[PDB]
From Swiss-Prot, chain A:
Database matches in PROSITE patterns: ATPASE_ALPHA_BETA
Residues the record lists as Phosphoserine modifications: 335
GO biological process entries: proton motive force-driven ATP synthesis; proton motive force-driven mitochondrial ATP synthesis
Note: Present with 164000 molecules/cell in log phase SD medium.
Protein name, entry field: ATP synthase subunit beta, mitochondrial
Binding-site residues, ATP: 152-159
UniProt function note: Mitochondrial membrane ATP synthase (F(1)F(0) ATP synthase or Complex V) produces ATP from ADP in the presence of a proton gradient across the membrane which is generated by electron transport complexes of the respiratory chain. F-type ATPases consist of two structural domains, F(1) - containing the extramembraneous catalytic core, and F(0) - containing the membrane proton channel, linked together by a central stalk and a peripheral stalk. During catalysis, ATP synthesis in the catalytic domain of F(1) is coupled via a rotary mechanism of the central stalk subunits to proton translocation.
UniProt cross-references to PANTHER family, sorted A to Z: ATP SYNTHASE, ATP SYNTHASE SUBUNIT BETA, MITOCHONDRIAL
Similarity comment text for this entry: Belongs to the ATPase alpha/beta chains family.
Keyword flag ATP-binding: yes
Curated annotation (Swiss-Prot), chain B:
Known role: Mitochondrial membrane ATP synthase (F(1)F(0) ATP synthase or Complex V) produces ATP from ADP in the presence of a proton gradient across the membrane which is generated by electron transport complexes of the respiratory chain. F-type ATPases consist of two structural domains, F(1) - containing the extramembraneous catalytic core, and F(0) - containing the membrane proton channel, linked together by a central stalk and a peripheral stalk. During catalysis, ATP synthesis in the catalytic domain of F(1) is coupled via a rotary mechanism of the central stalk subunits to proton translocation.
Protein family: Belongs to the ATPase gamma chain family.
Name of the protein: ATP synthase subunit gamma, mitochondrial
Protein localization: Mitochondrion; Mitochondrion inner membrane
Effect of residue 41 to A: In ATP3-5; dominant suppressor of the slow-growth phenotype of yme1 strains lacking mitochondrial DNA
Miscellaneous notes: Present with 28100 molecules/cell in log phase SD medium. PubMed:12898710 reports two tandemly repeated copies of ATP3 (ATP3a and ATP3b) on the right arm of chromosome II in several laboratory strains, including S288c. This has not been confirmed by the yeast genome sequencing project.
Full-protein positions shown: 257 to 309 of 311
Subunit-level organization: F-type ATPases have 2 components, CF(1) - the catalytic core - and CF(0) - the membrane proton channel. CF(1) has five subunits: alpha(3), beta(3), gamma(1), delta(1), epsilon(1). CF(0) has three main subunits: a, b and c.
Curated annotation (Swiss-Prot), chain D:
Record protein name field: ATP synthase subunit alpha, mitochondrial
Record gene name: ATP1
Parent-record interval covered: 138 to 239 of 545
Binding site for ATP: 69-76
Organism expressing this protein natively: Saccharomyces cerevisiae (strain ATCC 204508 / S288c) (Baker's yeast)
Family according to the record: Belongs to the ATPase alpha/beta chains family.
Function, in words: Mitochondrial membrane ATP synthase (F(1)F(0) ATP synthase or Complex V) produces ATP from ADP in the presence of a proton gradient across the membrane which is generated by electron transport complexes of the respiratory chain. F-type ATPases consist of two structural domains, F(1) - containing the extramembraneous catalytic core, and F(0) - containing the membrane proton channel, linked together by a central stalk and a peripheral stalk. During catalysis, ATP synthesis in the catalytic domain of F(1) is coupled via a rotary mechanism of the central stalk subunits to proton translocation.
Subunit structure: F-type ATPases have 2 components, CF(1) - the catalytic core - and CF(0) - the membrane proton channel. CF(1) has five subunits: alpha(3), beta(3), gamma(1), delta(1), epsilon(1). CF(0) has three main subunits: a, b and c.
Length: 470, 53, 204, 102, 469
């Protein structure tokens, strides 16, 4: 059949070296299948080492391999299935459905690798997404076609933040979305599967307005790496060939970096800083560049990033930090303050915010908020030791507003009926600008601090003031 | 008489504070410098070990 | 209870304590003492996991303690460098995350078609200097569903057992909390959080 | 001279597709800097148009001054501003005032 | 037929032999190259094949001309043990360096030995009264336990041990082993002299102590198997004599260190920092041969030279696991003039538990720990501000804690010369009484100099009168 037949020579982890026969060069980045009593082990060809001996990375677990096993060649990068047939049905890295909602329903395939869209292809967005999440809406508006980036620490409900985004934004937007999970727990997986069945986004009968690619961290590091490529190609089929404007979601992209770092060592490369792959920049670059809004479709990626020990100075977060468009920083501390959303308001920044883009009023309002908060933080040290007393009357009004603004940001989420147990609230962007404007004007500086805490809009704050009064 | 002594005491105390704080700056500065050097060296050693293989 | 890297005498005291408390009956002690070979130490959690899976498979509910996982990492380091594999960050092999993750992820709450079987897991990591940026601790932190930080200063402070409740998190939150206990402890979280903020201010 | 108003990639291929470059040489990219004797001391300013830059931190000509700062603080915006103020001088006809920014 | 070989390489003290004869001696066999200095004892550690071993060299490795005859003495070096090896100082190869004539031997046992099984272990719970107050309060020793020191650069590390020998080893009256790995010659000479002087070695009499001394002049490889030799001497006592013993090891940092040196030469990619990949296994083997079986209860005292006081360095870290109780000694606390220099917030014992040592003792100790932790907490405030800017309630605590710290300094009898103050041995019951009172502030109203460098509460009270004058 495929004359490309190889005999294993060395199984040493993910590295499996094969000794293909004369004249058989399975090109770099091809996909090899080795028939095994476990199924077909997929090896992605990653080097030619000479005399028809390749060095390949495994994409499925290694065990039982016998030196000499016949190796067929698919002949090209892993060919996934694409279609609207991929909607619904969870798809594992190789492509096989692991929720087993029938066989591969797709009629088309595409390779995992692809060449990033050219400079010419790029189309500059300016449409402004509305998330309904107030901190986002005023202080770092997201853009429809954006590359939103959820830098944050583990266990802040990194997933929870994303779940809220899917909960609001995904259903709201008509277009398909692809939920791609890179190296996440099957606990999280089951929750996500259940949750989007619950929100009905996954429609078991009838088309789902989403496709799912759950890649979990129980898969070898190599397999973890090419979960990203797989998800991306599905998105590309939607973006390009169906022309749909999609909103990509990937989770957690530090796992993508981490995965690459692990197989770097195995590939025998000189380990770089904090053990990261030397190819860190270009590998990130290929992934990130592939994800973009073109003159074809518009992709709105939301990428979770895990910042190890909350040090953004760690090169891997910093590299991603450059490649993204609309950063969001989620302060663990602020989560602990009980403020949910847990966003770090000063550090969250989106280039999208501009007096032209969101209008002069929005800009001015947001400048005033930022200044108020920045002052509050600056004064926080003074209040700490000296004690607030000799800080001006003006300062006291600013501080009073800041403590209030700090808790006006707080606003429950429906998917944190699980957590907080408070039904969600999502307020229109235009309305949020108005409501925050009111706070700054100080018309509600007679309202108690706790009557701003964990509630929606200004109307709600007023209602909770009345409620607390009673 | 008391108030003058109070404000005077506050001046004296805050002055002595500046001195005490300065000493702590110096102690942590030496620690900082030592720590900074040590990190560079230890990381470098790991990189070298990897290259050596 | 899985014991990796611990001295035969410590383990032996532990089993006596369990027998004193009459509970060895429901206990299995899987051991790979300090003496026992580094390959056997490396192999020890994964074979403990299998012992657990028999419960999980049976639909029986069980709990597996992997104490201390950190010494498994030391063992795998020994193996890898004498298998002459390229050295990773802190010399632990460059596939340690995969090893630790596969071990930990076998514990699960299965579905009712599988008889609601569950192995429950508690990994235990001895933190060296409390360095949460240390490679073995960092890796584990990502993998696990919650962290239950314990603090030495508070131990001395006399909270014994000591619990660094400020850094303790459960990302999978409260729903395994007894309904009654959920009601009573409803604002306990808020109160403690306020106590922490206030206490800090109070020093100066 | 034809690379004015041209976005080119490293190889020199126009990625803005403004067609073949009217480039009068292909010149090596590994050549050494003008010697001690081939220098004249700085005597021409550059106006960035940013007030602080123009007064507090003067910018001459044929000299290298760093722009060192924190990540993605719109570092590029500060730089781009210089290009814009140079438009005024550029519009002019003096060949010492025609700074062709790259 | 002694298996002959030639010396293929002489890369440091890790000589390599090539057995010309078929079938090489196995790993952990012992070999003699009969040097013109006497013999050199080498131990097979790798087989590199083609009948070429790589061997640890236990004596000096200079003057070796490549190609030298080998003879196979087989198996691990079998040291000589006996009930007549009591009072001998033996070299690495077991040769009596004290040279009170040829060694008296009966059974010679291999240096390497397997650690006794899980079922052979016997779990103790016995208390051992030290008489050192700080020890008694914070981490009371357990008889048959494994005690450990995590001191700085010979910060009276030896002196601390000497006090233990002085108190515990004359009290114990069982067999006892002193093994000093990388001991400095002066300290060794002093110990040998002291033992002979205090009759614990009576040279015409008999000794209840036996001695192994390994100088830090000794080549690194030799030092590695000094430890293993000592463990063998101990096993003979543990098993064959069947008596509860003492064992002293000073320092097992030198054991770890020695291993790290040889590791590089052996050809091992050296694990982080630099320690050998086999650091855990080697430490493990050593610490599981040291154990209380049902054949004997081996009380161990192990000393760790913490390298630059970095406990985070892997060798101290892996030591903490293998010790039943530890008494980390801190350079700062030494500077404060507290001898014992034991850090009081970094001490632990498994024996310290309310049931085990009485609820009252535990309560007292708890309060001491808490108080001292408060004092440590307020170190920041104390420096940044003054003492008067501390809360009044806290200021009482601080004053009490200052007293507690000073109270902890108790002169040692072996250090009586060095301190210039006669030593103090304080009863466990007395110690509890003293702290109990201090916590209730009963005698608190007297100088911190009064508490400084004196024994029990009665002594403190008496010294208050001295100071008062």
């Amino acid at each position: 059949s495929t004359p490309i037949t190889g005999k294993v020579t060395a199984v040493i982890g993910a590295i499996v070296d094969v000794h293909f026969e004369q004249s058989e060069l399975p090109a770099i980045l091809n996909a090899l299948e080795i028939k095994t009593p476990q199924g077909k082990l997929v090896l992605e060809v990653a080097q030619h080492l000479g005399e028809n001996t390749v060095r390949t990375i495994a994409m499925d677990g290694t065990e039982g391999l016998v030196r000499g096993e016949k190796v067929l060649d698919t002949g090209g990068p892993i060919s996934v299935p694409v279609g609207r047939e991929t909607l619904g049905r969870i798809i594992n890295v190789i492509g096989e459905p692991i929720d087993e909602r029938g066989p591969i329903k797709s009629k088309l395939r595409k390779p995992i690798h692809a060449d990033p869209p050219s400079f010419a292809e790029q189309s500059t967005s300016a449409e402004i997404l509305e998330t309904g999440i107030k901190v986002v809406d005023l202080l770092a508006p997201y853009a429809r076609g954006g590359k939103i980036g959820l830098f944050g620490g583990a266990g802040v409900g990194k997933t929870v933040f994303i779940q809220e985004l899917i909960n609001n934004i995904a259903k709201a937007h008509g277009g398909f979305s692809v939920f791609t999970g890179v190296g996440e727990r099957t606990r999280e997986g089951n929750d996500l599967y259940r949750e989007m069945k619950e929100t009905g986004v996954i429609n078991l009968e009838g088309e789902s307005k989403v496709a799912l690619v759950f890649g979990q961290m129980n898969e070898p590091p190599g397999a973890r790496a090419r979960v990203a490529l797989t998800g991306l190609t599905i998105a590309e089929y939607f973006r390009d060939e169906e022309g749909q404007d999609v909103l990509l979601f990937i989770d957690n992209i530090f796992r993508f970096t981490q995965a690459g770092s692990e197989v770097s060592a195995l590939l025998g490369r000189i380990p770089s800083a904090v053990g990261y792959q030397p190819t860190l920049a270009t590998d990130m670059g290929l992934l990130q560049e592939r994800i973009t809004t073109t003159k074809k479709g518009s992709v709105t990626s939301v990428q979770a990033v895990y910042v190890p020990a909350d040090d953004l100075t760690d090169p891997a977060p910093a590299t991603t930090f450059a490649h993204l468009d609309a950063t969001t920083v989620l302060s663990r501390g602020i989560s602990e303050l009980g403020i949910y959303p847990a966003v770090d308001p000063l550090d969250s920044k989106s280039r999208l915010l501009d007096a032209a883009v969101v209008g002069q009023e929005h800009y001015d309002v947001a400048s005033k908020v930022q200044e108020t908060l920045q002052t509050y933080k600056s004064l926080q040290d003074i209040i700490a030791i000296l004690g607030m007393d000799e800080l001006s009357e003006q300062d006291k009004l600013t501080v009073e507003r800041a403590r209030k603004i700090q808790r006006f940001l707080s606003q429950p989420f429906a998917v944190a009926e699980v957590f907080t147990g408070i039904p969600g609230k999502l307020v229109r962007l235009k309305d949020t600008v108005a409501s925050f404007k009111a706070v700054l004007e100080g018309k509600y500086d007679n309202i108690p601090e706790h009557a701003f805490y964990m509630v929606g809009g200004i109307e709600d704050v007023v209602a909770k003031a009345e409620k607390l009064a009673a | 008489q008391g108030y003058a002594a109070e404000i005077s005491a506050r001046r004296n105390a805050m002055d002595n504070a500046s001195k005490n704080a300065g000493d702590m700056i110096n102690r942590y500065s030496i620690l900082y410098n030592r720590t900074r050097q040590a990190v560079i060296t230890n990381e470098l050693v790991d990189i070298i070990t990897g290259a050596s293989s | 209870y899985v014991a990796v890297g611990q001295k035969r005498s410590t383990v032996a005291q532990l089993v006596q304590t369990l027998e004193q408390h009459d509970a060895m009956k429901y206990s299995i002690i899987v051991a790979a003492t300090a003496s026992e070979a580094a390959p056997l130490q490396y192999l020890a959690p994964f074979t403990a996991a299998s012992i657990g899976e028999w419960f999980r498979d049976n639909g029986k509910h069980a709990l597996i303690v992997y104490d201390d996982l950190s010494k498994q990492a030391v063992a795998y380091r020994q193996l890898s460098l004498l298998l002459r594999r390229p050295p990773g960050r802190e010399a632990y092999p460059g596939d340690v995350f995969y090893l630790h993750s596969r071990l930990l992820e076998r514990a699960a709450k299965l579905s009712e078609k599988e008889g609601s079987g569950s192995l429950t897991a508690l990994p235990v990591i001895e933190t060296q200097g409390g360095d949460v940026s240390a490679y073995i601790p960092t890796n584990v932190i990502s993998i696990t569903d919650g962290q239950i930080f314990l603090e030495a200063e508070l131990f001395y402070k006399g909270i014994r057992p000591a619990i660094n409740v400020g850094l303790s998190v459960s990302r999978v939150g409260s729903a395994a909390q007894v309904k009654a206990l959920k009601q009573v402890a409803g604002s306990l979280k808020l109160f403690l959080a306020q106590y922490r903020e206030v206490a800090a201010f109070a020093q100066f | 001279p034809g690379l004015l108003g041209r976005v080119v990639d490293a190889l020199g291929n126009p990625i803005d597709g403004k067609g073949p470059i009217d480039a009068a040489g292909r010149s090596r990219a590994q050549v050494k800097a003008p010697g001690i004797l081939p220098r004249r001391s700085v005597h021409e300013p550059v106006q960035t148009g940013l007030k602080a830059v123009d007064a507090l931190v003067p910018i001459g000509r044929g000299q290298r001054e760093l722009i060192i700062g924190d990540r993605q603080t719109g570092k590029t915006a500060v730089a781009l501003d210089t290009i814009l103020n140079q438009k005024r001088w550029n519009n002019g006809s003096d060949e010492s005032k025609k700074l062709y920014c790259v």
